[PDB]
PDB file of N, CA, C and O in Angstrom:
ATOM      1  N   UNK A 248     -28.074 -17.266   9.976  1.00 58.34           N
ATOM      2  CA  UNK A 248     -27.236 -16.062  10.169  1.00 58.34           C
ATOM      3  C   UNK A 248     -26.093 -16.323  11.115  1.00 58.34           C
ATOM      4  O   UNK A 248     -26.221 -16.251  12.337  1.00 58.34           O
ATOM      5  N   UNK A 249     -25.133 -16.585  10.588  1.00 56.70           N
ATOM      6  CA  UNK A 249     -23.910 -16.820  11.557  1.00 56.70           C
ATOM      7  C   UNK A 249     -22.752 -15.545  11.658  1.00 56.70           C
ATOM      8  O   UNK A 249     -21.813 -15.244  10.921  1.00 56.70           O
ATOM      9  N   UNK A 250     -23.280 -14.948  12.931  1.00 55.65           N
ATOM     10  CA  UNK A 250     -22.348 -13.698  13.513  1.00 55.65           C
ATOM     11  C   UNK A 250     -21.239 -14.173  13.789  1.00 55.65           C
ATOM     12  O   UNK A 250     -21.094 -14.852  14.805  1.00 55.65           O
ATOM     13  N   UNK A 251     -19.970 -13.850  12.725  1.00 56.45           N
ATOM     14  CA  UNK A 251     -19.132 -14.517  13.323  1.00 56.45           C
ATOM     15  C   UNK A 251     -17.909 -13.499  12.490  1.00 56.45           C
ATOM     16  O   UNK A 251     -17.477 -13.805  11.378  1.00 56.45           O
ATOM     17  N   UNK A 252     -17.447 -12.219  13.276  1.00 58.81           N
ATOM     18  CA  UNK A 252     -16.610 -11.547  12.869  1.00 58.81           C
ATOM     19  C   UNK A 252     -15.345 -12.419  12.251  1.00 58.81           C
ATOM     20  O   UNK A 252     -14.822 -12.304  11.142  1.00 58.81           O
ATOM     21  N   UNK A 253     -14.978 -13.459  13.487  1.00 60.05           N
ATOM     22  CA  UNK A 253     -13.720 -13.861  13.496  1.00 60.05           C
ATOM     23  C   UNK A 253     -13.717 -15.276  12.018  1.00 60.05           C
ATOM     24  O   UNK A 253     -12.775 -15.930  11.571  1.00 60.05           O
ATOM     25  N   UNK A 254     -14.819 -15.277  11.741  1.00 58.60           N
ATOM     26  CA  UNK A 254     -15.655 -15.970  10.209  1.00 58.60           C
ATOM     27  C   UNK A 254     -14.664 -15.399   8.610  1.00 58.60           C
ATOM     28  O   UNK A 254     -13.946 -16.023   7.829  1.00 58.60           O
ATOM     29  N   UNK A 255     -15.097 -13.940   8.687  1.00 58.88           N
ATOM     30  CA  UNK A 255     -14.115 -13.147   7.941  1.00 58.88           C
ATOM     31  C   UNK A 255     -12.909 -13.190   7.798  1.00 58.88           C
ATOM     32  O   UNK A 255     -12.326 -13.322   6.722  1.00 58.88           O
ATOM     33  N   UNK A 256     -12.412 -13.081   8.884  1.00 58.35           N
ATOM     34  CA  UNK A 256     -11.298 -13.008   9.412  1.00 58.35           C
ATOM     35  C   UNK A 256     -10.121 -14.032   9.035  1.00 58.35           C
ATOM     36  O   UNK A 256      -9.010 -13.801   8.559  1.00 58.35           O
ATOM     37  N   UNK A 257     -10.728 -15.238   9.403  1.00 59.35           N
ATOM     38  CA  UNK A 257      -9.541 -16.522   8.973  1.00 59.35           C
ATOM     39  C   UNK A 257     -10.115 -16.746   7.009  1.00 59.35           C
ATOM     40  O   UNK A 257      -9.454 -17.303   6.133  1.00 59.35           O
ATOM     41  N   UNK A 258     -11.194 -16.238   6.894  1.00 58.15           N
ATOM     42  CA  UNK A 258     -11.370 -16.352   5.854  1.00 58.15           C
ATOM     43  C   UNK A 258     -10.842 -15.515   4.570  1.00 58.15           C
ATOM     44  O   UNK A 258     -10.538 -16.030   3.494  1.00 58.15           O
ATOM     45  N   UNK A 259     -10.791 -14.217   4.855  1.00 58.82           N
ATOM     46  CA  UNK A 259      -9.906 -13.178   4.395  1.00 58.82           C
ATOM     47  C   UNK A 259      -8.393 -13.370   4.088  1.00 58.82           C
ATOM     48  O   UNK A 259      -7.689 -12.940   3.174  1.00 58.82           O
ATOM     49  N   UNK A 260      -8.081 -14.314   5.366  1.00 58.46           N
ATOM     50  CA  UNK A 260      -6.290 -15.353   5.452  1.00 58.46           C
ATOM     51  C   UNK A 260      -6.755 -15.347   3.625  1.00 58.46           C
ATOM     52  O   UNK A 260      -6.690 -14.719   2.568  1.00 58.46           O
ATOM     53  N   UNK A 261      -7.150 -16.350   4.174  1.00 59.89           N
ATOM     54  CA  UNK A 261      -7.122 -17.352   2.557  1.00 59.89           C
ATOM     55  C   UNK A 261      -7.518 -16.864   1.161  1.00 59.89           C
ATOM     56  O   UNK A 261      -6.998 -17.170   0.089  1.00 59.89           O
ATOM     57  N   UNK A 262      -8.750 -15.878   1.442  1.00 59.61           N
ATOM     58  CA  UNK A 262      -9.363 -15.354   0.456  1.00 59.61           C
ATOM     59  C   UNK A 262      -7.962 -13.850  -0.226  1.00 59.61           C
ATOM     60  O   UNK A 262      -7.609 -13.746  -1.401  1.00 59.61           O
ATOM     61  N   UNK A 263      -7.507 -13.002   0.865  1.00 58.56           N
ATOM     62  CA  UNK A 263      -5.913 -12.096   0.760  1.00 58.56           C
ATOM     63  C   UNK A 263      -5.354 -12.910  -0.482  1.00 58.56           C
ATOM     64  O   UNK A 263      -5.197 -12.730  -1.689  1.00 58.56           O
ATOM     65  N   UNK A 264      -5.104 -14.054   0.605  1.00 58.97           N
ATOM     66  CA  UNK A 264      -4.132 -15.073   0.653  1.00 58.97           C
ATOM     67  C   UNK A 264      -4.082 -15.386  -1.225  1.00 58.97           C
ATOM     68  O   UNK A 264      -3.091 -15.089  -1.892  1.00 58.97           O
ATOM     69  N   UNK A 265      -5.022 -15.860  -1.674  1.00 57.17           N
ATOM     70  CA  UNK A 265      -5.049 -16.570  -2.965  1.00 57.17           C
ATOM     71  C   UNK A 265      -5.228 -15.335  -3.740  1.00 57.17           C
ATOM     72  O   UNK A 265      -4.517 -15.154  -4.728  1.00 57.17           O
ATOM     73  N   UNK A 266      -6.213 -14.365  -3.349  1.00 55.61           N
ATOM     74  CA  UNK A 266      -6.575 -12.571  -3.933  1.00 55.61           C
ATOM     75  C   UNK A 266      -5.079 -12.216  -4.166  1.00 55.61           C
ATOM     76  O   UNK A 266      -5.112 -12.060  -5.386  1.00 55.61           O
ATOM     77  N   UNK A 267      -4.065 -12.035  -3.882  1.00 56.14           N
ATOM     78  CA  UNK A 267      -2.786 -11.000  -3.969  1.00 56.14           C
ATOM     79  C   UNK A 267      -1.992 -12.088  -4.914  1.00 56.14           C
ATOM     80  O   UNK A 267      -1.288 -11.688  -5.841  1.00 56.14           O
ATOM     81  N   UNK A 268      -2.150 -13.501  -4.623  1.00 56.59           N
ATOM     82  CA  UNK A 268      -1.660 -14.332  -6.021  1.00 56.59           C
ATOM     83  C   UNK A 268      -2.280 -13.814  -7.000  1.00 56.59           C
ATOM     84  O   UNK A 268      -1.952 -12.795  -7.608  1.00 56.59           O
ATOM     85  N   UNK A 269      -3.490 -14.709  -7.250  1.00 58.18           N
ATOM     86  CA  UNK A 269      -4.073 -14.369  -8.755  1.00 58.18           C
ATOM     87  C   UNK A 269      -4.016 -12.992  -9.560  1.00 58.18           C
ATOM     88  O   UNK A 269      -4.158 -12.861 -10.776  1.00 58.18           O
ATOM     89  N   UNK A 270      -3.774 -11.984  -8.606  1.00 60.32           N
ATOM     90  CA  UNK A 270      -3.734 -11.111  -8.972  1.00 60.32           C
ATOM     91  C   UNK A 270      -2.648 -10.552  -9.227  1.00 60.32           C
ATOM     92  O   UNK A 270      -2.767  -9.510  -9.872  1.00 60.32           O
ATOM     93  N   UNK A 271      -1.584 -10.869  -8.951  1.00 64.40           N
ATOM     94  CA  UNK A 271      -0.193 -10.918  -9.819  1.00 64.40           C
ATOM     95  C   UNK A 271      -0.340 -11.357 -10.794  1.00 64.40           C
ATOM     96  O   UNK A 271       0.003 -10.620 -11.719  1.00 64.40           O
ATOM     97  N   UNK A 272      -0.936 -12.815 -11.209  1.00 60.51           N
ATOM     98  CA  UNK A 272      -0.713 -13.102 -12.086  1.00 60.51           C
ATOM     99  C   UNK A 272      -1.102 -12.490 -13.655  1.00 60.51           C
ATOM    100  O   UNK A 272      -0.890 -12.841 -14.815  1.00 60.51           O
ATOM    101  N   UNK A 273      -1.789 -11.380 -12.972  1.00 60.79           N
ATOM    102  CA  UNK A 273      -1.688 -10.665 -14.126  1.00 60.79           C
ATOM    103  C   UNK A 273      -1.320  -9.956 -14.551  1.00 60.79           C
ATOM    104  O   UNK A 273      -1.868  -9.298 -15.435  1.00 60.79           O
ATOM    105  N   UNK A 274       0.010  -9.751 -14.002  1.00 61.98           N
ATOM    106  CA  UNK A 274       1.327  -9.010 -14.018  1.00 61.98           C
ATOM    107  C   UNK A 274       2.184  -9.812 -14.580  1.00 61.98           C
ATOM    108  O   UNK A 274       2.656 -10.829 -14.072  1.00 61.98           O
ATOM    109  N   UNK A 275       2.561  -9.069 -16.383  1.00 65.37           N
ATOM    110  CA  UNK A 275       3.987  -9.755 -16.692  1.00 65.37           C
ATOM    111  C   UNK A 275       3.431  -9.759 -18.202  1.00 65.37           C
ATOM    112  O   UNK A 275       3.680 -10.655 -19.008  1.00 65.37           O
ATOM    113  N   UNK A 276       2.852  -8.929 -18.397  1.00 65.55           N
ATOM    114  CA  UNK A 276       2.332  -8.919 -20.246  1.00 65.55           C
ATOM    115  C   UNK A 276       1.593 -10.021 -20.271  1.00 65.55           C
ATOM    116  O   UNK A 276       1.823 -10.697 -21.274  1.00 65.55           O
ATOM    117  N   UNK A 277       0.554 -10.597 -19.341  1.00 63.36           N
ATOM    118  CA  UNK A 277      -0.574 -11.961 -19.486  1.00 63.36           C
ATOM    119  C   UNK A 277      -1.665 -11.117 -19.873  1.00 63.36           C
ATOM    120  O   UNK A 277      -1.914  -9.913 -19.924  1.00 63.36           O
ATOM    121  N   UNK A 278      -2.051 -11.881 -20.048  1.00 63.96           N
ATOM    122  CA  UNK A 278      -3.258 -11.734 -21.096  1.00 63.96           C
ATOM    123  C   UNK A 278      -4.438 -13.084 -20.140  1.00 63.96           C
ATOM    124  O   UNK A 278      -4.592 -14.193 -20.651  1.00 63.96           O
ATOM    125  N   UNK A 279      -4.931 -12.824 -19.177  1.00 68.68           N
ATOM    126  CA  UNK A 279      -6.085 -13.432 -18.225  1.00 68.68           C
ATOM    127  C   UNK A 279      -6.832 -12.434 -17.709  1.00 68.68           C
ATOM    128  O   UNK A 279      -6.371 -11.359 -17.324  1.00 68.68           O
ATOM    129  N   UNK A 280      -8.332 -12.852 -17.678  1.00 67.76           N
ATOM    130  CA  UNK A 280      -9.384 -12.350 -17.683  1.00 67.76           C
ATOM    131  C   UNK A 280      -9.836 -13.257 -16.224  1.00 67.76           C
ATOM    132  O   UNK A 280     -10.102 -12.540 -15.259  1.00 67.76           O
ATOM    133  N   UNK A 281      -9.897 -14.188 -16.092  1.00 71.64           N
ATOM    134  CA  UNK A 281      -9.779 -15.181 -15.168  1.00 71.64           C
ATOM    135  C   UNK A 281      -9.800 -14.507 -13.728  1.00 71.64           C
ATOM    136  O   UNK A 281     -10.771 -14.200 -13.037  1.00 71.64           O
ATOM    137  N   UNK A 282      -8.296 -14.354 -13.456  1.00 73.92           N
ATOM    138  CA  UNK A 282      -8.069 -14.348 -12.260  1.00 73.92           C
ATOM    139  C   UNK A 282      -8.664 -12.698 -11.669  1.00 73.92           C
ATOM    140  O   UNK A 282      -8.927 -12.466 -10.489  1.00 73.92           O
ATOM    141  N   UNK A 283      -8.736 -12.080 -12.366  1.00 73.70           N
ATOM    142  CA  UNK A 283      -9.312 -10.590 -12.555  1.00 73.70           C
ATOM    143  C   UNK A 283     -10.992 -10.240 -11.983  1.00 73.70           C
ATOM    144  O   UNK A 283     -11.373  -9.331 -11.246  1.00 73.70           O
ATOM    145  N   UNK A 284     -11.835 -11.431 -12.695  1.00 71.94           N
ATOM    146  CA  UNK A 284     -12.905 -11.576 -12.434  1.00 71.94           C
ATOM    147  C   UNK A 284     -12.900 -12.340 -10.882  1.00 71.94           C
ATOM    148  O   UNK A 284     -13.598 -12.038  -9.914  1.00 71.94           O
ATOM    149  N   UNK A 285     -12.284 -12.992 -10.945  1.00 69.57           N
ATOM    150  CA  UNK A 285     -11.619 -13.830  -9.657  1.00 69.57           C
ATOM    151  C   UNK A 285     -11.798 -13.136  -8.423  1.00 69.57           C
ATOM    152  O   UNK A 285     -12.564 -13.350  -7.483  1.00 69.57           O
ATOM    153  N   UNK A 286     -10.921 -12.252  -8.623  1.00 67.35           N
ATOM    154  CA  UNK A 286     -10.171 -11.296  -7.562  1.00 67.35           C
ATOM    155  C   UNK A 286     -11.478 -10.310  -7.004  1.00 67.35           C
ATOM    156  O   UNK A 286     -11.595  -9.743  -5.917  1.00 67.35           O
ATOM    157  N   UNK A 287     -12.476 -10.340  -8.275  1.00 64.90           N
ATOM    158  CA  UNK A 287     -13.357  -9.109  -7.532  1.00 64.90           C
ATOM    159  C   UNK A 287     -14.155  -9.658  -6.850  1.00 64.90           C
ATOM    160  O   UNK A 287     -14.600  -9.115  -5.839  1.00 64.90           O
ATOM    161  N   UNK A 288     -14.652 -11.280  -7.380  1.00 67.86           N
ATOM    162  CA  UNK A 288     -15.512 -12.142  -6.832  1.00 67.86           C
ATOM    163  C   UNK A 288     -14.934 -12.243  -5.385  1.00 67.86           C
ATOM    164  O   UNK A 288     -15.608 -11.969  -4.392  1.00 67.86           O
ATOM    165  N   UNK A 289     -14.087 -12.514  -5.356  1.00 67.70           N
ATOM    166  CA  UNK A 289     -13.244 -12.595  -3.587  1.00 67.70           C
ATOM    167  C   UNK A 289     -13.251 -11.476  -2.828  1.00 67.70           C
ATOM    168  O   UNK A 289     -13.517 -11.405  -1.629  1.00 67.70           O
ATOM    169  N   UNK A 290     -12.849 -10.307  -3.816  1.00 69.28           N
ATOM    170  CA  UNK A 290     -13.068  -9.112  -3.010  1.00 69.28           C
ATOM    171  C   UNK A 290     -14.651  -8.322  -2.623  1.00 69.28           C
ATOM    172  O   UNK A 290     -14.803  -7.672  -1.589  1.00 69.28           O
ATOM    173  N   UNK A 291     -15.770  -8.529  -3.678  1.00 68.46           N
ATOM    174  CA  UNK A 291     -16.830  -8.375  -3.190  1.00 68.46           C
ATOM    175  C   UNK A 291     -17.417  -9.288  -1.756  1.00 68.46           C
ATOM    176  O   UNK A 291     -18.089  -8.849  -0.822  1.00 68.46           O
ATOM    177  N   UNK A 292     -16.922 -10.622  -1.963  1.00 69.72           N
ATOM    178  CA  UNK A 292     -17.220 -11.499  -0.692  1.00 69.72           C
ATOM    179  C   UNK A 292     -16.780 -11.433   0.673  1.00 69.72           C
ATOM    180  O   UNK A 292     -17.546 -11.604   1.621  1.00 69.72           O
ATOM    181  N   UNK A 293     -15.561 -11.188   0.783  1.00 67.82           N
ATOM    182  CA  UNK A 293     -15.062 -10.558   1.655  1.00 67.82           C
ATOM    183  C   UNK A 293     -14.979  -9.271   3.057  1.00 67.82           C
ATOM    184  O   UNK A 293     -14.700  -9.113   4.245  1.00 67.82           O
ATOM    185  N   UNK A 294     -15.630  -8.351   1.370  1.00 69.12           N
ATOM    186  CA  UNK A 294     -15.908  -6.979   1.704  1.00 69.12           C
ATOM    187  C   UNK A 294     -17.722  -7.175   2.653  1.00 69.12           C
ATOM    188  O   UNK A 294     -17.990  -6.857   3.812  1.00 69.12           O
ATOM    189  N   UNK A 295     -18.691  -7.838   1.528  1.00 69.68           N
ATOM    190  CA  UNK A 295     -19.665  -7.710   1.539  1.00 69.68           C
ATOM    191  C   UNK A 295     -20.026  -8.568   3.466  1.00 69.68           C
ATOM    192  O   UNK A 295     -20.856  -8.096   4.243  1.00 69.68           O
ATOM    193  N   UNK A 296     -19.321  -9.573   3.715  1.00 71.29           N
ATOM    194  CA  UNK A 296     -19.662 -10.926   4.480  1.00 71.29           C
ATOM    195  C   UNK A 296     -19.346  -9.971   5.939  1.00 71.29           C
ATOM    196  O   UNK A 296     -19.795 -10.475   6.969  1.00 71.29           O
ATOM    197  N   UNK A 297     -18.849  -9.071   6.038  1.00 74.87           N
ATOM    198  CA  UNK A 297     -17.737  -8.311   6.935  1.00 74.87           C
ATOM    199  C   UNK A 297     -18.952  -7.706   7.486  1.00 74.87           C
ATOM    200  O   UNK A 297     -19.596  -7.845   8.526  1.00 74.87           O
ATOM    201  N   UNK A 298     -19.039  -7.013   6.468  1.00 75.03           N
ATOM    202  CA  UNK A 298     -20.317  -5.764   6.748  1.00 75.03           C
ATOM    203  C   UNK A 298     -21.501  -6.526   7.001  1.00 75.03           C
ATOM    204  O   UNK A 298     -21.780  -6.587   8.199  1.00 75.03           O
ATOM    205  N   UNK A 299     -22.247  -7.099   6.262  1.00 74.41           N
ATOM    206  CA  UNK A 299     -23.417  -7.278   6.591  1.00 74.41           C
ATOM    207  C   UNK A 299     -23.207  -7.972   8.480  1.00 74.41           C
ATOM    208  O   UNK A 299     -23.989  -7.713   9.394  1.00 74.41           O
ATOM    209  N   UNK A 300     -22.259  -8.634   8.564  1.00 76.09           N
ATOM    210  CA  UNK A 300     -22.001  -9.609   9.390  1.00 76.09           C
ATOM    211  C   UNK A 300     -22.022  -8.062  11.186  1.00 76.09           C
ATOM    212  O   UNK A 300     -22.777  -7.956  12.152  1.00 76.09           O
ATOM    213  N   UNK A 301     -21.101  -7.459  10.846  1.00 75.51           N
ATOM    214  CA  UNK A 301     -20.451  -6.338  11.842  1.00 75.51           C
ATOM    215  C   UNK A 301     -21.091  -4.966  11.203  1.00 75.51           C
ATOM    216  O   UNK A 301     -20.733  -4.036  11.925  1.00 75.51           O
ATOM    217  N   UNK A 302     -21.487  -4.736  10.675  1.00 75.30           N
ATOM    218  CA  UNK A 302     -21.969  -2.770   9.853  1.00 75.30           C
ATOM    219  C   UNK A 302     -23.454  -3.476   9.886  1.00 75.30           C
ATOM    220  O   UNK A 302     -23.920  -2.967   8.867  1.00 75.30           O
ATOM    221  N   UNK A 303     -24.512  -4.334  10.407  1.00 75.93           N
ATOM    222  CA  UNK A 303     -25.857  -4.542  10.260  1.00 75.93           C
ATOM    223  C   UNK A 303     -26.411  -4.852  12.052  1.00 75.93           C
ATOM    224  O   UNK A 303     -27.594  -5.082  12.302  1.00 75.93           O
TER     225      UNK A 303
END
């Protein structure tokens, strides 16, 4: 169990970071399923790592 708010944090950088790309990219008449599934996978992890970590 590693309490480590600031864990999220630089991780979120990156996880935002690549989340607000891929997720354009499905902006522009594309047709990806990919980055979509992507984006929630990052955003459930994110969301989830936060909380259990700081809300437990």
């Amino acid at each position: 169990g590693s309490e480590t708010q600031a864990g999220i944090k630089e991780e979120i950088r990156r996880q935002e970071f690549l989340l607000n790309s891929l997720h354009r990219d499905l902006q522009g008449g594309i047709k990806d399923l990919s980055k979509e599934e992507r984006l929630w996978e990052v955003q459930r992890i994110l969301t989830a790592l936060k909380r259990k970590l700081r809300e437990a």
